Amino acid sequence: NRRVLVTGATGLLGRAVHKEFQQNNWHAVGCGVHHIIHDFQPHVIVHCAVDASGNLAKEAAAVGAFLIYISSDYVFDGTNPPYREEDIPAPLNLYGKTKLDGEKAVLENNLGAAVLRIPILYGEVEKLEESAVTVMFDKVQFSNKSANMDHWQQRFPTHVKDVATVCRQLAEKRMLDPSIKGTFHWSGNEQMTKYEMACAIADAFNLPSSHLRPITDSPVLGAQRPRNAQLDCSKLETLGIGQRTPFRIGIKESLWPFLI
Ligand SMILES: [Cl-]
């Protein structure tokens, strides 16, 4: 009788996490929440999102639940990759600052909580817009118009199923190890720009890619972005935790229903 509560269970990552636990002998309940936490008494809470997060950390502490707060590589300035969990964060934008404030809010209100920083995600989306990787597909698929692709920012596309497996593995290790707490990193091992991802998508579905224009210049509009906020995963790898899907396989599985 192992119980897990997955917040944001309707989202891309939430659905993968909920299903990973459920298919591996866990009684999984998903939220699309203080009453649910008392009635279910979950052993583990996987939070997919600051005042609410900090309040959820208190609720988790009160029932003795292992809380996993999902965070981002955007907490780092991406000037000196790779980034260890012991490295000092320096968020360049509001997204990174909110995630870092979220982490602090959780770790300050729950001493046994874990933070899992992950990079750009993709998976079996219901809508192309659900992922910043999958939203590109129609620009790749249709060659009638030239399409500018970022070839400046270094990313590590990670399958939500990899993040889901790591969440379950971290939760299962914690069950027999109370030292499992603090900050953790998980990421795919393939360094790719949006242009390199578009190229990999084109090749996976045997599509023409000559209409794709790589933009190698630094951004000139919008919020400041980390060039290479690569996460090092030695911490989890030493613990025997991890799963990594090759992008060319993971993106084929994910985008197959949207091929026109
Ligand atoms: Cl923006």
Author numbering: 28 to 59, 78 to 94, 114 to 324
Extract from the study:
MAT (methionine adenosyltransferase, also known as S-adenosylmethionine synthetase; EC 2.5.1.6) is the only known enzyme that synthesizes SAM (S-adenosylmethionine), the principle methyl group donor and precursor for polyamine and glutathione synthesis. The function of MAT2A is further dependent upon an interaction with the auxiliary subunit MAT2B, encoded by the MAT2B gene. MAT2B was proposed to modulate the catalytic activity of MAT2A by lowering its Km value for its substrate Met and the Ki value for its product SAM.
A small-scale treatment of purified hMAT2B with limited amount of trypsin, chymotrypsin or subtilisin generated stable truncated products (asterisk). The purified truncated polypeptides, found to have molecular masses of ~28 kDa (subtilisin-treated hMAT2B) and ~32 kDa (trypsin-treated hMAT2B) by MS, were subjected to crystallization trials. The subtilisin-treated protein (hMAT2Bsubt) yielded diffraction-quality crystals allowing its structure determination at 2.2 Å resolution in the unliganded form. Minor structural variations between the two structures are found in a loop region of the second domain (residues 282–289, loop C), forming an extended coil in the hMAT2Bresv structure and a two-turn helix in the MAT2Bsubt structure. The importance of loop L1 to NADP binding is also evidenced from the MAT2Bsubt structure, in which the segment Phe60–Ala77 was not present in the structure (probably owing to subtilisin proteolysis) and no electron density for the NADP cofactor was observed despite being included in the crystallization buffer. The hMAT2Bresv structure did reveal a head-to-tail dimeric packing for the two NCS-related protomers within the asymmetric unit, but it probably represents a crystallization artefact for the following reasons: (i) the C-terminus involved at the interface is partly derived from the vector-encoded sequence (AENL; residues 335–338), (ii) no equivalent dimerization is observed in the hMAT2Bsubt crystal lattice, and (iii) size-exclusion chromatography of full-length hMAT2B does not reveal a dimeric species in solution.
